Copies of this chain bind each other. A is one copy, B any other.
Amino acid sequence: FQKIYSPTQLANAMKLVRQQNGWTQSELAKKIGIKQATISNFENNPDNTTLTTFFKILQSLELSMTLCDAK
């Protein structure tokens, strides 16, 4: 799949996914115990965002994460 190299690349990526599954920042947030503002924050200023927030959000989207070589 696509190799990401930045928080911004990341946000857009996950934003797309949420948009794709017709999910709302509010939905995911309620399922993993974080504020819907936290998700709005993550999609516009992902530069400064706890790794934990990262994975919870990541879990609410039902995706995982792996590390590969930047070819």
Contact = CB atoms under 8 A, between A and B. Distances in A.
Copies in the complex: 2
A12 to B, nearest CB: 12
Contacts of A14: 67
Contact of A65 (B17, B55, B68): B68
Interface residues of A, number: 32
A4 B65 contact: yes
A68 B67 CA distance: 10
Interface of A: 1-7, 10, 13-14, 17, 46-52, 54-55, 58-59, 62-71
24 contacts: A1-B66, A1-B67, A2-B66, A2-B67, A3-B65, A5-B55, A5-B59, A5-B65, A6-B55, A7-B54, A7-B55, A46-B51, A48-B50, A48-B51, A49-B50, A49-B51, A51-B54, A58-B67, A62-B70, A63-B70, A64-B67, A64-B71, A65-B68, A66-B68
